Each structure stands twice: as C-alpha cells, then as structure tokens.
Symmetry: C3
Subunit: 147 residues, 3 copies
C-alpha cells in the first residue's frame, strides 16, 4: 500500500529532524551536511539564511559552535503534513540547554521549527527550515556542569 | 496485516498527542477541537473536566489561554497499550514552560497524561485524557523572554 | 517489503527506550525487568555495570530509587542504525528533573544513551545500555514540588 511508503517516509523525516539536533550538539559535520538539499534554505531568525550543506557548515562552524562551550537540543512535538507523497510541511519544538562562551553563561532556549522536506529519487532531505527563538533565558545563578 | 494497521494507528495517535499540545501552545482553535469525540472527556486535576470539542474550546478560551501570556508543552515518552484494534490506553510525560499572566511569573510544570484513544470509522481521536501535575514551580529570578529582552536593564 | 519488519522493529525499540524511563520514574519493577536480556549490560558512568533483568532491579532498588524522592526522565532524539535485521545501535538524549534525598535538592541532569538492541526469536530487548551524564546541576532557589505546596 501507500501507507507503508508513508510510514517509511515519517521514519526517514524523524531521522532528519533528530540528525540535525545530534549533529549540532555532538559537532558532527558529515551528519549535519547530509540532511540538506543543495538548494535548501536554513534560516535562524536574528542570524540569517544559509543555503545547502555548505551553508549549514558555515552557520555551524562560524556561529553556532563558537557561540557555545556545549549545548543539548531536545526535539519534540514533530508534526508532519504530507502535501504529497514527496513533500511534507513539518512543525517542531526544541528545548535547548547550554553554556554560552560569552559570559560563560548557562541559558535555556525554547524555539519553534517550521520545516519543509522533499523526497528526490527515493531520498528525503530538508528543503527548508525556519527557526524562531521564543525564549532565550540566562539562568540567573545556576551553572550547568558535569558531575 | 494488522501489523501495518498497528503501525499506522500508532502514527495517528502520536499526531493526536502532539496536536493537543501544539493547539494549546499555538492557540489554534481548529486543531484543538478536531482531536476529540463528542463524548470525549478532558480532565486536568485542579482545573476540572470538560467534554467534547466545545468543552476543549471552553477550557482553552476561558482558562488556559487567559492563564498564560504564552506557554510551551514538550511531550515525550508516549507509550501505547492496544486494548483492541480500535481502543488504546496511553501514558505520556510533558514538560511545560510558560509565563503566568497573574504576576507575569515564569513557571515549570511536569505532568503525566493518562489517555484513552478511540477509532470510529477509520478515524482516531481522544476518548479521554487525564492530566496530573507532579511539579508546579514558579521560577526564582528567572523570567522566560524573547532574545531581545536581553540587553534591556 | 520487510520495511514493515524494520518499521515494526523501530516501534518495539522505541517502547524499550520509553519503558526504561517510565519504569524508573513510576517505580515499576515489572516494567524495568522486562526490557533487558539476561546477558544485558546496563552501565551508568560514575556508578557501575549491572547485568540482566536482575542487576537492573539491583541498580534500581539500591541506587537510583533510594537516591531520589521522585524524578522524571524526558527522553528525546532517539536515532537508530540497523547493524543486522536483528541487531541495532541507538543513541538518545535525556532530560532528567528530580529531588535528591541528599539535601532535598532539586537537580537537572542531561545525559546521553549509547544503546544496543538485540532481537532473539521475534522479541526485541536491550542487549546493552551506556548512560553518560553531561550536566548534573543543583538548581539554586528552586524546589520542585506538587502544586498544593505553593499554597500557604
């Protein structure tokens, strides 16, 4: 049936969603580069729009990674609508915990992802991502640290 | 196979579970209403029990939305038990961060969902939801705010 | 195709992933024991390496349950790669919030799971779990409490 394809597609898209978060947190360039079409546009509001795997690597190396000593994104609430068998609009929520290099300050971030995915010759990648930051909160007098 | 049917039903119920949260957080009346049967029953301990889509809109508009400037629900750990092909029990955990209108106070809530889902005519919806809150914590000198409220005094 | 098999495998492993957490949080020995193979190795760096459904209970009853009044694990970002059709590797992230008995202290934990899963005779369980904790921080003027404790 076409349901098996749609379930295989959901699984694939949940992996792209997770990979993006994992790649950034664990600093894995290859993982990060592999999730984007060449013409894909990743936008972080307040930062800019970056195009394809190279753009993704630019943003990571030049902004995201220098910005944080370390961080963790917790991805939830991934909700897909299949426009067709081969294109999906996604929404998702993330909770980001980390330490800003600047001020060496523990923050909590809450952000919304507005995504588009596309299958091309049997393969799903991101076609678009917009990231909007709703909460950006320096945690008063707590500092995240290992045990 | 009822193996595909099981997988396909898990997906729709997952979508039910997320939709509820999104509709509350993004204040989407049409998504909120679409997920309940007429006889479905939504209870929040300490808040009350509401019935059907209209009950859901009633709670949202008159209690939830007025209570917070905004909030966000992070739903995780959805675990399903298929009672029958058209009946499932679910448990789930939620982390809620928000700002209460009363005192413009930032809160963290940890809550458990105890859910029942019902399939009528190929369509899954909530038959029941109980929301039980384990943590309810106003935050210290902490206030959740957009990134630009930084570099203000 | 056996996509269905891989899809069914993904679903069962996802339940394994969430059961470990639900069992510990809700304090459910029947759930906690049922998710491990008898040769399963569950390691939490900084603690120890326990084996099978029984060492899993040993870790629970004598270490983590006495350690917390209550806790909640939020598990996310579970990513799987299939090594064979019967064994898979997993990674996952977890956000743990809880009250330590020691000091009655509200804490936040951030941790990573490196997991292996094994299918024996049509049944998936944990072949192994590694838990590495990256943040483990007491939260200062904050105490996690039921909403009624807020009143007077």
């Amino acid at each position: 049936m076409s349901d098996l394809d749609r379930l295989a597609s959901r699984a694939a898209i949940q992996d792209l969603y997770s990979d993006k978060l994992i790649a950034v947190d664990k600093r894995q360039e290859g993982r990060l580069a592999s999730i984007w079409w060449d013409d894909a546009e990743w936008t972080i509001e307040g930062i800019g729009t970056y195009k394809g795997p190279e753009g993704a690597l630019d943003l990571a190396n030049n902004v995201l990674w220098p910005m944080f000593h370390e961080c963790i994104h917790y991805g939830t609430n991934l909700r897909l609508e299949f426009v067709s068998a081969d294109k999906v609009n996604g929404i998702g929520d993330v909770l980001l915990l980390g330490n800003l290099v600047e001020g060496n300050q523990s923050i909590l971030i809450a952000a919304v992802f507005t995504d588009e995915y596309e299958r091309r010759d049997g393969v799903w990648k991101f076609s678009k991502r917009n990231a909007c930051t709703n909460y950006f909160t320096p945690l008063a007098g707590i500092h995240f640290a290992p045990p």
